Design a protein around this ligand. Structure first.
Ligand SMILES: C=C1/C(=C\C=C2/CCC[C@]3(C)[C@@H]([C@H](C)CCCC(C)(C)O)CC[C@@H]23)C[C@@H](O)C[C@@H]1O
Ligand SMILES: C=C1/C(=C\C=C2/CCC[C@]3(C)[C@@H]([C@H](C)CCCC(C)(C)O)CC[C@@H]23)C[C@@H](O)C[C@@H]1O
Lengths: 10, 239, 239, 10
């Protein structure tokens, strides 16, 4: 899902 | 000849992006789990890499054209290059004198040995340090260093990439800027460019080796529990 | 009357288990990400809780009869009680004088305020401190304290438990030991037992509230990325 | 899966 990468990429 | 405005603006964006994501004093390192000399150094290096990924992401979002890519391709590019972008930016802390990455007192100075205590072998560390030495010797300008990172990040030759046509184009425009810059602003840099591309290939091999060693470290819960959510997400195989 | 050999042996096992999983000097706390006074205290408290879970697990494996349970029930019991076992063992560091958990210099002394910076509200902290105060006032013997933790851990009334019949029995045998002990070895402890069971009920409520607040903290990746794999696994809903 | 809890419980 990449929850963190998504959020950080704004 | 001479650089164009667009070319020069791209350079401005990247240099500033890097300045905004790379502290030469390394003051944040105290917020990391302390280093310790089974895999006693893993907690500190995990935090160092995790912190660094966050920084690579910040720099990435400022690479001209990257944020226009689909979130899926941004992630694909980050996940496969992160490790290489990290080895590249770490060169700023590497020292040919002591063959180490010096970021602080005795604590934040990293030797091949220390990385061994993070679960990695010479199979990786030897080429890494060897790579760090060669790259340091190219005495790159901050502008060429920042371009080399943007170019490495926009390698369309990454697993999971979709729009590998637009990515391909973006990497090309950057490669053009780096080439022009070297020719116009870097005296005695006739061979430089070719040498810098060769460095990208060394990174692929380092990336591959690190991936192998990481997988092993990753499958052992007693060790994986020492990593961080972000590190687990970026270096994980769940895509 | 007087305790039986089996009853006394159970007490010996638990007291030693606790001694082997609880350092009164708290020297390991320096290996935790430093505390900092958005949710500046989360990194340190996450490491504190993560470290503590590891300790609760070690103590658990030494509770007589627990290791015979299926791995599935062991996990079910750990996951649902961990948070409560932690609040219970933390009482050893709590101080009625300063209404805080004192584990080190100015750094490792935790006030309600500090926990607020970990993403929690008074909705939880008020009862917690209130619970810590009440429990401290029972001046439990190390033997009663260790039994109260083993009893709390073997509550068959936990979601996901299967063999709730054998668990039920084990908790009962411990409850028998605690009751006998109080009656035989604790002068003026006529009401004690009843008071200790009441404490288990307060823990259920604290557990519930913490779960709510944790869920919110958990759904925000910017925050969840600050937790640790173990904390994410034990407090997560993936069962 | 509880990879970590399993391993720690030995
Ligand atoms: C990070 C940065 C620095 C150094 C990089 C190093 C030295 C220690 C060991 C590292 C982190 C190598 C390790 C093979 C990677 C191990 C990670 C893991 C354990 C998860 O598999 C790769 C690059 C090396 C410091 C500073 O330059 C910022 C930069 O950004
Ligand atoms: C750990 C231990 C200690 C204190 C416990 C505390 C003080 C700080 C805040 C804590 C950790 C409460 C927090 C509500 C829990 C927050 C965790 C999270 C952010 C994941 O939702 C629960 C118990 C509290 C120190 C020592 O007694 C060992 C013990 O074992």
């Amino acid at each position: 899902r990449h929850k963190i990468l998504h959020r950080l990429l704004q | 000849h001479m650089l164009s405005d667009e070319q020069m603006q791209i350079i401005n964006s990247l240099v500033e992006a890097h300045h905004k994501t790379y502290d030469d004093s390394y003051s944040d390192f105290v917020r990391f789990r302390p280093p310790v000399r089974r895999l006693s150094m893993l907690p500190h290096l995990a935090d160092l890499v995790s912190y660094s990924i966050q920084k690579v992401i910040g720099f990435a979002k400022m690479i001209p054209g990257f944020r226009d890519l689909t979130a899926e391709d941004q992630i694909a590019l980050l996940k496969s290059s992160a490790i290489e972008i990290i080895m590249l930016r770490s060169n700023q802390s590497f020292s040919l004198e002591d063959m180490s990455w010096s970021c602080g007192g005795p604590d934040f100075k990293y030797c091949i040995n220390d990385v061994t205590k993070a679960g990695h072998t010479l199979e990786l560390l030897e080429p890494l340090v060897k790579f760090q030495v060669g790259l340091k010797k190219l005495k790159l300008h901050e502008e060429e260093h920042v371009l080399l990172m943007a170019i490495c990040l926009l390698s369309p030759d990454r697993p999971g990439v979709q729009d590998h046509v637009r990515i391909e184009a973006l990497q090309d425009r950057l490669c053009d800027v780096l080439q022009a810059y070297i020719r116009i602003q870097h005296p005695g840099g006739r061979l430089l460019y070719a040498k810098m591309i060769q460095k990208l290939a060394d990174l692929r091999s380092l990336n591959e080796e690190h991936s192998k060693q990481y997988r092993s470290l990753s499958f052992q819960p007693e060790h994986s529990m020492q990593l961080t959510p972000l590190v687990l997400e970026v270096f994980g195989s769940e895509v």
